[PDB]
A and B are shown apart, each in its own frame.
Chain A
């Protein structure tokens, strides 16, 4: 009645929703508040004047005729006041639990003796009663900042790779194994130009092209354009990103590179300050004001410049354990036989009594002693030092941005941005909340390098596990790697008696229903799942397909059923029939990702899906287009890219999403592009012995030296890289002689200072 349905959660009044109360709380907790910096007042300039090369893009309507730039004689302090919903005064449709589904689950439990039915109903009701989908609160966000600072500086303070004992080259040798990469396509431009110069526009569809990375148009522009999207500020971003990279390049080759580079960095300070966006999630009601995860929303120009380094490399590097002999999980999909490929790799390891490691950003998976371990970095991003990102930049510029002859696919200006400035713009820099400019501890979550920097930190933890003789994750010896690496982590899952569990999963596989005998019905009694929680997926054995298939981890499935995400796109929500199409999508997607294998959930969701489809026929609205392009309407859209929901879900839909394109032979997987014959273990034993301290390549040696020399030496460094980046006659011997020359002047300790510290100082100058 009103006892079955839990009461709606009404968040308490937030006592820290004012700058005074927020500042006092952070002060009482010793959290660093910066002296606020101001942005010059916006000036409405002619886009034709600011971007003359793109005059044709203005007249064709691809850019606004005016551009607003911070050039004014007066300045302003930026202010960012995000919405937190639901809140004490607004408990509406946003974050509303699916009470209709709870009613349906109860009715079908009344009529069906499903052995897992009572546990499914209780779990959905408990999730509705204890969880809340929403954007948390100011208190939640502020307490989260304290927890991040705690991971960075508390019980286990962060350590740079150098402090742990790795050079840039030693880390690169590990990343060749844990994150194998290819070079960007030959047709893609080198890192040598201003972003706007990557736009080739005239009108001709046969030639017109943009080599810039794809951006989310509806996402936040960030500073200095609060309240604007990326689509709203395209011209502004190009003008600002162009001016920053050009002013940096000029300043570095000026009569005083230290004063020049520092002036540019302070003039564009706001390019290092992220809007502290409250992340929409299924939070615990009891901890609503204790924890709101934060999205560090990078300014559009900073995101564009960073993405120009990473995305041309990563587009060509979808290499993982299912298609390459690497522990990496980058670009993994459990669909189209992905999960069965993983289960084949796991089963072969267990039969051959071999240990196994898998890495995905802040997620580590270890198979040892007939046990599966899921290890996650604790609040990952907070463990990142600017030096971790600098080591990733080294790896991308040496292994990615390199020609076949070994010459660099970048010039000194882009080597300066990537190595000497960029890591301090998004790591240990600052954020904006209300009128408060707060310190950021670690890397800003959501920045372009979030995955890459987290993947490098997990690589360090895994390399140290291999070095320590692979101690079991449940022992003190493994937990001691926290202090050894400066990286906090925790064992999130332990799946004991793995061999036996896989045998049980195969033997308990149902004979009835979906992917079993092929009828359009859930099994009465589902088989045992292999609860790997591999990027949120469990494995279930299919008798029909004779393979393991993925099912969304139970806790995630229940949370998503209890609190569905609605249409979080104003434009699509405005379109007619979209909201009623979303209703069908919600119940079909929950079935697709794994609800099909939960008999109570599948009976209730199928009913909801067909009843919503019947309501659509009554109103006479055609939503076929929306149901075909359902991906953008669902949180589960990012997987099943080529499936349509225009026809109701059947057993054939489940067969199709699990159909492999090719047969799998693990021995047939190509080796990594670099050091193919070497295993991660052989690389670790070499590093332990002191190998790969310095790269053999003089170009790479110059890039490593660049991480150690102060900003006043940048012009000399530019002269050292100029022959190689220009590919002049006999550049190799010239770069070789210039590196040897630069190595000698490095005996002057006064020339040794991290440019990353110099960047941070200038960013925080008043």
Chain B
């Protein structure tokens, strides 16, 4: 449900 496209 939450957008999760690896994080900066």
A211 contact from B1, B3, B6, B8, Cβ within 8 A:
B3
**A413 to B8, Cβ gap below 8 A?**
yes
Name the residue on B nearest A244 (C-beta).
B8
Determine whether the beta carbon of A194 is less than 8 Å from that of B4.
no
Interfacial chain B residues near A186, Cβ < 8 Å: 1-2
With beta carbons under 8 angstroms apart, the residue of B3, B7, B8 that contacts A188 is B3
Residue on B with the closest CB to A403? B2
Q: A718 → chain B, closest Cβ, in Å?
A: 12
Contact among A187, A192, A200, A209 for B8, CB-based, below 8 A:
A192
Contact: A189 with B8, CB < 8 Å? no
Out of A189, A246, A411, A413, which one reaches B3, CB within 8 Å?
A: A189
Contacts of B4 in A (CB 8 A): 189
B2 touching A193, Cβ below 8 Å: no
Interfacial chain B residues near A200, Cβ < 8 Å: 3, 5
| Residue picked from A197, A198, A245, most chain B C-beta under 10 Å | A197
State in angstroms the CA–CA spacing of A224 and B8 once bound together.
23
Q: Are A192 and B2 in contact (CB under 8 A)?
A: no
Measured CA separation A271–B2 after assembly (Å): 30
What distance in Å separates the Cβ of B8 from its nearest Cβ neighbour in chain A?
A: 5
Q: How many Å lie between the Cα of A200 and that of B5 in the bound state?
A: 8
Question: Does A193 lie within 8 Å of B1, measured CB to CB?
Answer: no
B4 — nearest CB in chain A belongs to which residue?
Answer: A189
Interface majority SS (helix, strand, loop, mixed), chain B: loop
Are the C-beta atoms of B8 and A411 separated by less than 8 Å?
Answer: yes
Within 8 A of B (CB), among A167-201: 186-190, 192-194, 197-198, 200
Residue from the list B1, B5, B6, B7 in contact with A187, Cβ < 8 A: B1
Q: Select A249's contact among B3, B5, B6, B8, beta carbons within 8 Å.
A: B8
Q: Is A414 an interface residue (CB 8 A)?
A: yes
A198 to B7, CA, bound (A): 11
> What residues of A have a CB within 8 angstroms of the CB of B2 in the complex?
186-190
Q: With the chains together, A211 CA to B2 CA distance in Å?
A: 11
State in angstroms the CA–CA spacing of A581 and B5 once bound together.
45
Q: How distant is the Cα of A481 from the Cα of B7 in the complex, in angstroms?
A: 45
Chain B residue nearest to A246 (CB atoms) is B8
Q: Judge whether B3 and A194 touch: CB under 8 Å.
A: no
Of chain B, the residue at the smallest CB distance from A409 is B2
Q: How far is the CA of A189 from the CA of B4 in the complex (A)?
A: 6
Query: Which residues from B are CB-within-8-Å of A209?
Result: 3
Across-interface contacts of A197 in B (CB, < 8 A): 5-6
A211 to B5, CA, bound (A): 11
Collect the chain A residues with CB atoms within 8 Å of residue B3's CB. Answer: 187-189, 198, 200, 209, 211
Q: Is the CB of A194 within 8 A of B1?
A: no
Expressed in whole angstroms, the Cα–Cα distance for A334 and B7 within the complex equals 43
Give B2 Cβ to nearest chain A Cβ, in Å.
6
Q: Closest approach, in angstroms, between the C-beta of B6 and any C-beta of chain A?
A: 7
What string of 1s and 0s marks CB contacts (under 8 Å) between A16-59 and chain B?
00000000000000000000000000000000000000000000
Residue of A188, A193, A414 touching B5 (CB-CB under 8 A): A193
**A63 nearest CB across to chain B (Å):** 17
Chain B residues whose C-beta falls within 8 Å of the C-beta of A198 in the assembled complex: 3, 5
A192 to B3, CA, bound (A): 11
Contact residues in B for A188 (Cβ distance below 8 Å): 2-3
Distance between B4 CB and nearest chain A CB, rounded to angstroms = 7
**B residues near A246, Cβ cutoff 8 Å:** 8
Bound complex: CA A748 to CA B4 (Å): 39
Q: How far is the CA of A245 from the CA of B8 in the complex (A)?
A: 7
How would residues 377 to 416 of chain A score, 1 for a CB under 8 Å from any chain B CB and 0 otherwise? 0000000000000000000000000000000000101100
Q: Does the CB pair B1–A413 fall under 8 Å?
A: no
Decide if B1 touches A192 in the complex (CB within 8 Å): no
* A193, A413, A414: the one within 8 Å of B6 (CB): A193
Name the residue among B4, B5, B6 with the largest chain A CB count within 10 angstroms.
Answer: B5
Most B Cβ at <10 Å: residue of A192, A209, A211, A413: A192
Q: B7, A413: Cβ atoms under 8 Å?
A: yes
Q: Which residue of B lies closest to A185 (CB)?
A: B2
Shortest CB–CB separation between residue B1 and chain A, in angstroms?
6
Closest Cβ–Cβ distance, residue A287 to chain B (whole Å): 47
Chain A residues with CB under 8 A of B5: 189, 193, 197-198, 200
CA–CA, A468 and B5, complex, Å: 51
How far does the alpha carbon of A559 sit from the alpha carbon of B8 in the complex, in Å? 50
Report B-chain residues with C-beta under 8 Å of the C-beta of A413.
7-8
A143 to B2, CA, bound (A): 49
Beta-carbon contacts under 8 Å, A425-460 to B:
none
In the A-B complex, list the 3 residue pairs whose CB atoms are closest, starting with the nearest.
A192-B7, A197-B5, A189-B3
Residues of A within 8 A of B (CB): 186-190, 192-194, 197-198, 200, 209, 211, 245-246, 249, 411, 413-414
- Given A189-B3, A411-B7, 6 more pairs with CB closer than 8 A: A186-B1, A189-B5, A190-B2, A192-B7, A209-B3, A245-B8
Can you identify 23 A-B contacts, CB atoms within 8 angstroms? A186-B1, A187-B1, A187-B2, A187-B3, A188-B3, A189-B2, A189-B4, A189-B5, A190-B2, A192-B7, A193-B7, A193-B8, A194-B8, A197-B5, A200-B3, A200-B5, A209-B3, A245-B8, A249-B8, A411-B8, A413-B7, A413-B8, A414-B8
